[PDB]
Structure 1
Amino acid sequence: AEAGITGTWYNQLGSTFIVTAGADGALTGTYESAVGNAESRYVLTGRYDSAPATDGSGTALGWTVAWKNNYRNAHSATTWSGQYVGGAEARINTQWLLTSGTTEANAWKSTLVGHDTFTKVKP
């Protein structure tokens, strides 16, 4: 649900995700990573299922962050694909892909894969 997704979330690495879920299925906010070639906040944009199933299923969503802001440019972008599970302890479970720009030759080693779990902070 939008209200459930909107808020401040943190993951196991200590990164911060601030997001607003719009009525049209949109997600906008900023992301701050605790690791990597990144500093300060970066803009994020994404989409989510604004009409999930009426059962105990998670709400599918995803977002992207290109790691360029006014202070650094890492020449990379990460996309997180996962689901939102609301409740007393709401979590967003994801798997992500991080692609770095490379020459054709090194293209075989351009993408990392991992997974992150986010916990919502009260409010």
Structure 2
Amino acid sequence: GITGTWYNQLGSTFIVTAGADGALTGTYESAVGNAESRYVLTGRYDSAPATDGSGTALGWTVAWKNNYRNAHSATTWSGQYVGGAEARINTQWLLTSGTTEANAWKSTLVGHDTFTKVK
């Protein structure tokens, strides 16, 4: 149920493939999806989740660098996939920028994203 295209509320598109071994691979891109806005993503997920109705734990990372741009930062999303007619992936994320020692205290932003199968 995880493999496929996902959309968040900001205007980003998450294209992912869930491997049978628990691997997550794909790309993260803008609404348009042009070459310069495409970034590689890799992650892991619980390939054998509980059957008590609980969600499927997962997480992935995107380093904001590709062959055209580099924002010297990386974001990690941690959350869970909830299946159903209105499937969704609920996450909380951490965006860390490369900083000098003096600015390390303010190197990490925290937020939350909800991804759906429909725009």
Render the CA deviation track for 1:1-23: whole Å, top value 9, x for unaligned.
Answer: xxx00000000001000000000
Deviations, residues 1-59 of structure 1 (Å, cap 9, x unaligned): xxx00000000001000000000000000001469999411000000000000021000
Percent identity, please.
100
Which SS does the other structure have where 2:104 is aligned?
helix
Aligned mate of 2:8, from 2, 8, 11: 11
Moved over 2 A (4+): 33-39
TM-aligned CA distance change 1:75 to 1:104, over 3 Å: same
Does 1:56 find its partner at 2:53? Answer: yes
The answer as to whether partners of 1:65 and 1:79 remain within 8 angstroms in 2 is: yes
TM-score after normalising by structure 1: 0.90
TM-score scaled by structure 2?
Answer: 0.93
- How many pairs does the alignment contain? 119
> Where does 1:111-122 land on structure 2 (aligned, <5 Å)?
111-121=108-118
Secondary structure, in 3 states, of the residue corresponding to 1:39? helix
Please, which runs of 5 or more residues in structure 1 have no aligned partner?
A: none
C-alpha contact 1:79 1:96 (8 A) present in aligned 2 = yes
Q: Which runs of 5+ in 2 are unaligned?
A: none
Contact 1:38 1:67 in 2 (8 A): no
Aligned CA distance change for structure 1 residues 96 and 118 (closer, same or farther; 3 Å) = same
- Structure 1 contact 96–113 (Cα < 8 Å) conserved: yes
Over the aligned positions, Cα root-mean-square deviation in angstroms equals 2.6
Distance 1:77 1:5 in 2: 22
Q: State the Cα distance separating 1:121 from its structure 2 match.
A: 3.8
In structure 2, relative to structure 1, the CA distance for the partners of 1:120 and 1:37 (3 Å cut) is closer
- Call closer, same or farther: CA 1:47–1:36 in 2, change over 3 Å: same
- In the alignment, the residues of structure 1 paired with residue 65 and residue 89 of structure 2 have an alpha-carbon distance, to the nearest angstrom, of 24
